[PDB]
Amino acid sequence: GPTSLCCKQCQETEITTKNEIFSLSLCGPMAAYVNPHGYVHETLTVYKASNLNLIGRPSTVHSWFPGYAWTIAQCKICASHIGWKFTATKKDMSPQKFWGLTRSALLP
Ligand SMILES: [Zn+2]
């Protein structure tokens, strides 16, 4: 479908849709400055994703989104690294999980 964002390598496999896109605030209370940590502009954040295999267990090491652990996520079909699943370290956070997907790894 027109909303469909698929793995660029295998083409057929849908990873997320444009419907699931949202904007995560990279700042904390009062919207203070933060040093950029990783490369967020290149990363698309979505609430829900599909057809990915999670590799290993959640890690907090040098997380691009502080407060969240990350787990590598690769296409079930072709094993291309599309991005990461992010899971909250604290119960009071929202969303408790989301996906950060490398834009260049998707089509469109
Ligand atoms: Zn693929």
Side-chain angles (χ1 to χ4, degrees), residues 24-35 37 66 93:
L24 181 84
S25 168
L26 303 186
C27 59
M30 287 77 77
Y33 177 83
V34 296
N35 321 89
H37 301 291
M93 290 170 77

Short mmCIF file of all heavy atoms in Angstrom, two decimals, residues 24-35 37 66 93:
data_model
loop_
_atom_site.label_atom_id
_atom_site.label_comp_id
_atom_site.label_asym_id
_atom_site.label_seq_id
_atom_site.Cartn_x
_atom_site.Cartn_y
_atom_site.Cartn_z
N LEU A 24 9.40 11.67 18.85
CA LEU A 24 9.87 11.52 20.22
C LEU A 24 10.68 12.75 20.60
O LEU A 24 11.53 13.19 19.83
CB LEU A 24 10.72 10.26 20.37
CG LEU A 24 11.26 9.95 21.76
CD1 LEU A 24 10.24 9.21 22.62
CD2 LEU A 24 12.56 9.16 21.66
N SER A 25 10.36 13.34 21.75
CA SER A 25 11.11 14.49 22.23
C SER A 25 12.48 14.07 22.75
O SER A 25 12.57 13.21 23.63
CB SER A 25 10.33 15.24 23.31
OG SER A 25 11.16 16.17 23.96
N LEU A 26 13.53 14.67 22.21
CA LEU A 26 14.90 14.28 22.54
C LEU A 26 15.43 15.11 23.69
O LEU A 26 16.58 14.97 24.11
CB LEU A 26 15.79 14.46 21.32
CG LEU A 26 15.30 13.68 20.10
CD1 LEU A 26 16.29 13.76 18.95
CD2 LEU A 26 15.04 12.24 20.50
N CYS A 27 14.59 16.01 24.20
CA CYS A 27 14.97 16.84 25.32
C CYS A 27 14.23 16.39 26.57
O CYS A 27 13.29 15.60 26.50
CB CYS A 27 14.65 18.30 25.01
SG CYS A 27 12.90 18.58 24.68
N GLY A 28 14.70 16.84 27.73
CA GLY A 28 14.08 16.49 29.00
C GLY A 28 13.23 17.62 29.54
O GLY A 28 12.80 18.49 28.78
N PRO A 29 13.04 17.66 30.87
CA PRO A 29 12.22 18.70 31.47
C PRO A 29 12.58 20.11 30.98
O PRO A 29 13.75 20.42 30.78
CB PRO A 29 12.51 18.55 32.96
CG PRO A 29 12.81 17.09 33.13
CD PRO A 29 13.52 16.68 31.86
N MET A 30 11.56 20.90 30.67
CA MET A 30 11.74 22.30 30.29
C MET A 30 12.39 22.46 28.92
O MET A 30 12.63 23.58 28.46
CB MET A 30 12.53 23.07 31.36
CG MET A 30 11.72 23.34 32.61
SD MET A 30 11.57 21.89 33.67
CE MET A 30 13.19 21.86 34.43
N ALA A 31 12.65 21.34 28.26
CA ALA A 31 13.22 21.33 26.92
C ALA A 31 14.61 21.96 26.85
O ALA A 31 14.89 22.76 25.95
CB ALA A 31 12.27 21.98 25.93
N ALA A 32 15.49 21.54 27.75
CA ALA A 32 16.88 21.99 27.76
C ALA A 32 17.70 21.45 26.59
O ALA A 32 17.29 20.51 25.90
CB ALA A 32 17.53 21.63 29.09
N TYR A 33 18.86 22.04 26.40
CA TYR A 33 19.76 21.59 25.38
C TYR A 33 20.21 20.18 25.74
O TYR A 33 20.27 19.82 26.90
CB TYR A 33 20.95 22.52 25.38
CG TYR A 33 22.04 22.15 24.43
CD1 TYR A 33 21.96 22.51 23.11
CD2 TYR A 33 23.19 21.53 24.86
CE1 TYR A 33 22.98 22.24 22.23
CE2 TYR A 33 24.22 21.24 23.99
CZ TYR A 33 24.09 21.59 22.67
OH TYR A 33 25.10 21.34 21.79
N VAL A 34 20.41 19.36 24.73
CA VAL A 34 21.10 18.10 24.93
C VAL A 34 22.16 17.95 23.89
O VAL A 34 21.97 18.33 22.74
CB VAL A 34 20.17 16.89 24.81
CG1 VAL A 34 19.11 16.92 25.90
CG2 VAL A 34 19.57 16.82 23.42
N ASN A 35 23.29 17.38 24.29
CA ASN A 35 24.30 17.06 23.31
C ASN A 35 23.68 16.00 22.43
O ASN A 35 23.01 15.09 22.92
CB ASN A 35 25.57 16.55 23.97
CG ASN A 35 25.89 17.30 25.24
OD1 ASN A 35 25.45 16.92 26.32
ND2 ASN A 35 26.63 18.40 25.11
N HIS A 37 23.72 12.65 20.72
CA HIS A 37 24.49 11.48 21.11
C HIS A 37 24.81 10.55 19.94
O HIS A 37 25.95 10.08 19.77
CB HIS A 37 23.76 10.70 22.20
CG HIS A 37 23.49 11.50 23.44
ND1 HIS A 37 24.49 11.91 24.29
CD2 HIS A 37 22.33 11.97 23.96
CE1 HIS A 37 23.96 12.60 25.29
NE2 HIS A 37 22.65 12.65 25.11
N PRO A 66 18.27 8.32 25.48
CA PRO A 66 18.45 8.12 26.91
C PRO A 66 17.14 7.80 27.62
O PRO A 66 16.11 8.40 27.30
CB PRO A 66 18.99 9.47 27.39
CG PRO A 66 19.74 9.99 26.21
CD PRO A 66 18.95 9.54 25.00
N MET A 93 7.43 6.13 31.80
CA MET A 93 7.75 6.73 30.50
C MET A 93 6.68 6.40 29.46
O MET A 93 5.96 5.41 29.60
CB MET A 93 9.12 6.24 30.02
CG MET A 93 10.27 6.81 30.84
SD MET A 93 11.83 6.01 30.44
CE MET A 93 12.24 6.82 28.89
#
